[PDB]
Design an enzyme around this catalytic site. Structure first.
Site, PDB file in Angstrom:
ATOM      1  N   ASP A  92       0.811  -1.236   0.000  1.00 19.91           N
ATOM      2  CA  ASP A  92       0.000   0.000   0.000  1.00 19.91           C
ATOM      3  C   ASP A  92       0.842   1.283   0.000  1.00 19.91           C
ATOM      4  O   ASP A  92       0.321   2.397   0.037  1.00 19.91           O
ATOM      5  CB  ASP A  92      -0.933   0.064   1.227  1.00 19.91           C
ATOM      6  CG  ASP A  92      -1.610  -1.245   1.611  1.00 19.91           C
ATOM      7  OD1 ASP A  92      -2.273  -1.849   0.744  1.00 19.91           O
ATOM      8  OD2 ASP A  92      -1.551  -1.651   2.789  1.00 19.91           O
ATOM      9  N   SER A 117       2.602   6.591   0.180  1.00 19.75           N
ATOM     10  CA  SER A 117       1.611   5.800   0.920  1.00 19.75           C
ATOM     11  C   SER A 117       0.214   6.299   0.546  1.00 19.75           C
ATOM     12  O   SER A 117      -0.083   7.493   0.601  1.00 19.75           O
ATOM     13  CB  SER A 117       1.849   5.736   2.432  1.00 19.75           C
ATOM     14  OG  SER A 117       1.548   6.928   3.116  1.00 19.75           O
ATOM     15  N   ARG A 118      -0.660   5.390   0.128  1.00 22.73           N
ATOM     16  CA  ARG A 118      -2.044   5.696  -0.299  1.00 22.73           C
ATOM     17  C   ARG A 118      -2.940   6.149   0.840  1.00 22.73           C
ATOM     18  O   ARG A 118      -3.787   7.021   0.679  1.00 22.73           O
ATOM     19  CB  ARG A 118      -2.619   4.437  -0.927  1.00 22.73           C
ATOM     20  CG  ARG A 118      -1.890   4.198  -2.237  1.00 22.73           C
ATOM     21  CD  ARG A 118      -2.271   2.843  -2.778  1.00 22.73           C
ATOM     22  NE  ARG A 118      -1.167   2.357  -3.600  1.00 22.73           N
ATOM     23  CZ  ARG A 118      -1.247   2.082  -4.870  1.00 22.73           C
ATOM     24  NH1 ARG A 118      -2.294   2.322  -5.577  1.00 22.73           N
ATOM     25  NH2 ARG A 118      -0.269   1.523  -5.489  1.00 22.73           N
ATOM     26  N   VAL A 119      -2.704   5.540   1.993  1.00 24.70           N
ATOM     27  CA  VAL A 119      -3.366   5.767   3.269  1.00 24.70           C
ATOM     28  C   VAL A 119      -2.934   7.120   3.861  1.00 24.70           C
ATOM     29  O   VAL A 119      -3.467   7.530   4.886  1.00 24.70           O
ATOM     30  CB  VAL A 119      -3.050   4.589   4.212  1.00 24.70           C
ATOM     31  CG1 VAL A 119      -3.860   4.594   5.504  1.00 24.70           C
ATOM     32  CG2 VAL A 119      -3.293   3.217   3.576  1.00 24.70           C
ATOM     33  N   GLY A 120      -1.960   7.835   3.270  1.00 29.65           N
ATOM     34  CA  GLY A 120      -1.510   9.112   3.819  1.00 29.65           C
ATOM     35  C   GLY A 120      -2.700  10.035   4.028  1.00 29.65           C
ATOM     36  O   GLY A 120      -3.626  10.076   3.221  1.00 29.65           O
TER      37      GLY A 120
END
Lengths: 127, 55
Positions: A92, A117-120
């Site tokens: 991810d 990071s995509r979740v950032g």
């Protein structure tokens, strides 16, 4: 076990590159037909069947969690190699370390203009 | 490593673009400056003649 009981866990794999090499050895000695960079075709399923087990469960399942930090070593900066591109597509986000920044005195040696990071945002606190 | 050569190619190409851009604007500036310097010659000659012949 900790995730299934509602607790949090972190799992580190010191090097997935040596784990792929160990599988290449067994598969070639068992005579399975080779592919790209001499590895077996089965090698994407090897790491994806592993890394997809890290997850945050729903409240009906108990709300437990398991996060993973796999590590990979690149030969002379070749990020385009088979096992590196394979695991870059599964995760991810990726943290890129440069041999150039490390000798120049930027000590943690992280390439912030390439790492992602995509979740950032969702992961961080409001502050 | 191939990556070291490739990143060095991208950097040198950026420097080539940078140097060519500055060369052409300086060429344009020179064409005018050479003509400008030549255009003041009759004034520079006339002032030198009047101040010298008067002094």
């Amino acid at each position: 076990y900790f995730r299934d009981k509602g607790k949090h866990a972190l799992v580190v794999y010191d090097d997935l590159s040596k784990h792929a090499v160990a599988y290449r050895q067994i598969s070639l000695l068992l005579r399975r037909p080779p592919g790209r960079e001499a590895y077996p075709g089965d090698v994407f399923y090897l790491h994806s069947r592993l890394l997809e087990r890290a997850a945050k469960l729903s409240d009906e399942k108990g709300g437990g969690s398991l996060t993973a930090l796999p590590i990979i070593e690149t030969q002379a900066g070749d990020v385009s190699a088979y096992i590196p591109t394979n695991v870059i597509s599964i995760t991810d986000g990726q943290i890129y370390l440069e041999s150039d920044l490390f000798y120049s005195g930027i000590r943690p040696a992280i390439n912030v203009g390439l790492s992602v990071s995509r979740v950032g945002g969702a992961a961080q606190i409001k502050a | 490593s191939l990556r070291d050569i490739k990143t060095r190619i991208n950097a040198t190409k950026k420097t080539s673009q940078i140097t060519k851009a500055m060369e052409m604007v300086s060429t344009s500036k020179l064409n005018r400056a050479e003509q400008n310097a030549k255009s003041f010659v009759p004034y520079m000659e006339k002032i030198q003649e009047v101040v010298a012949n008067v002094a």
